[PDB]
Design an enzyme around this catalytic site. Structure first.
Site, mmCIF file in Angstrom:
data_model
loop_
_atom_site.group_PDB
_atom_site.id
_atom_site.type_symbol
_atom_site.label_atom_id
_atom_site.label_comp_id
_atom_site.label_asym_id
_atom_site.label_seq_id
_atom_site.Cartn_x
_atom_site.Cartn_y
_atom_site.Cartn_z
ATOM 1 N N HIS A 5 0.821 -1.215 0.000
ATOM 2 C CA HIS A 5 0.000 0.000 0.000
ATOM 3 C C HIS A 5 0.856 1.267 0.000
ATOM 4 O O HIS A 5 2.032 1.211 0.327
ATOM 5 C CB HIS A 5 -0.980 0.016 1.236
ATOM 6 C CG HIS A 5 -0.309 0.019 2.584
ATOM 7 N ND1 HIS A 5 -0.131 -1.160 3.318
ATOM 8 C CD2 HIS A 5 0.243 1.048 3.280
ATOM 9 C CE1 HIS A 5 0.471 -0.796 4.455
ATOM 10 N NE2 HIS A 5 0.719 0.518 4.484
ATOM 11 N N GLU A 56 -3.738 3.289 2.218
ATOM 12 C CA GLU A 56 -3.896 3.544 3.638
ATOM 13 C C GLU A 56 -4.154 5.020 3.857
ATOM 14 O O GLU A 56 -3.409 5.879 3.394
ATOM 15 C CB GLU A 56 -2.624 3.120 4.389
ATOM 16 C CG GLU A 56 -2.696 3.344 5.904
ATOM 17 C CD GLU A 56 -1.393 3.004 6.627
ATOM 18 O OE1 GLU A 56 -0.374 2.755 5.945
ATOM 19 O OE2 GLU A 56 -1.405 2.933 7.877
ATOM 20 N N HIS A 74 0.927 11.020 -7.786
ATOM 21 C CA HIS A 74 -0.476 10.619 -7.866
ATOM 22 C C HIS A 74 -0.601 9.120 -7.592
ATOM 23 O O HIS A 74 0.414 8.426 -7.427
ATOM 24 C CB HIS A 74 -1.006 10.930 -9.299
ATOM 25 C CG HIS A 74 -0.216 10.311 -10.421
ATOM 26 N ND1 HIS A 74 0.678 11.057 -11.171
ATOM 27 C CD2 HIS A 74 -0.245 9.051 -10.913
ATOM 28 C CE1 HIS A 74 1.199 10.225 -12.054
ATOM 29 N NE2 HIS A 74 0.667 9.009 -11.952
ATOM 30 N N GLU A 113 -5.018 9.295 -10.950
ATOM 31 C CA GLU A 113 -4.919 9.073 -12.380
ATOM 32 C C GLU A 113 -5.819 7.909 -12.804
ATOM 33 O O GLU A 113 -5.595 6.781 -12.388
ATOM 34 C CB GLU A 113 -3.452 8.781 -12.736
ATOM 35 C CG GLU A 113 -3.154 8.752 -14.236
ATOM 36 C CD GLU A 113 -1.756 8.331 -14.659
ATOM 37 O OE1 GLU A 113 -1.093 7.557 -13.933
ATOM 38 O OE2 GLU A 113 -1.337 8.752 -15.760
HETATM 39 ZN ZN LIG Z 1 1.543 1.625 6.005
HETATM 40 ZN ZN LIG Z 2 1.080 7.428 -13.290
#
Ligand SMILES: [Zn+2]
Ligand SMILES: [Zn+2]
Lengths: 119, 117
Positions: A5, A56, A74, A113
């Site tokens: 994450h 997260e 992004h 995106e």
């Molecule tokens: Zn984390």
């Molecule tokens: Zn990208």
């Protein structure tokens, strides 16, 4: 090894969850309050954390907003149709920076995106 | 739907790629110069982009460093042995900050290591 994450700090957790669930169809994977640390975490995504990367979200109780900087770019998400995702986000009142690829802004101004499936 | 990648801007793309490939065992998935936009990007990861999330690294030719705020948190990576990966990163000269651990990449972006599980 695998990417689990990315973590982003948010001024308002419920405002952030409302965007990821309504504009982006994400599901809350887990959520926990930490009074000892004065923060709450929420993990959101598409698949269970054991199968794919999640997002997260952290809210620090003693903060009302954060400095973004220009280092962070992004988060890219694969979608079935970028135009429908965009139109829905705009209908919900979210900022669509550019409109197959497109860009949304979450409530904190983090860029998302949209990459249409099969690109 | 699925998460494809996060993107981070780096002062020195060679320095960033040395960290991601050697300290974190990532593969350079793709690299492309865009003379028209005076930037270069590189995609790094473990699986091909069709199967799993990757990390996009961007360097803007006209920049020497980026403003780092406190909004962006970290990137978490699942590792077979956190103490081994940590020790290897240290052996390459990378900082390990304050089973879970935290590394800093060459630009100061935090990497959270989470032992598989
Ligand atoms: Zn984390
Ligand atoms: Zn990208």
């Amino acid at each position: 090894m695998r990417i689990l994450h990315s973590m982003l700090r948010v001024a308002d957790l419920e405002a952030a969850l409302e965007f990821y669930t309504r504009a982006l169809d994400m599901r809350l994977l887990r959520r926990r309050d930490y009074p000892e640390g004065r923060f709450t975490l929420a993990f959101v995504g598409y698949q269970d954390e054991r199968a794919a990367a999640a997002l997260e979200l952290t809210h620090n109780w003693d903060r009302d907003g954060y400095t973004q900087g220009d280092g962070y770019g992004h988060l890219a998400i694969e979608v079935e149709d970028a135009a429908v995702t965009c139109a829905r986000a705009r209908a919900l009142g979210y900022r669509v920076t550019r409109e197959v690829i497109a860009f949304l802004e979450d409530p904190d101004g983090y860029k998302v995106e949209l990459i249409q499936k099969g690109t």
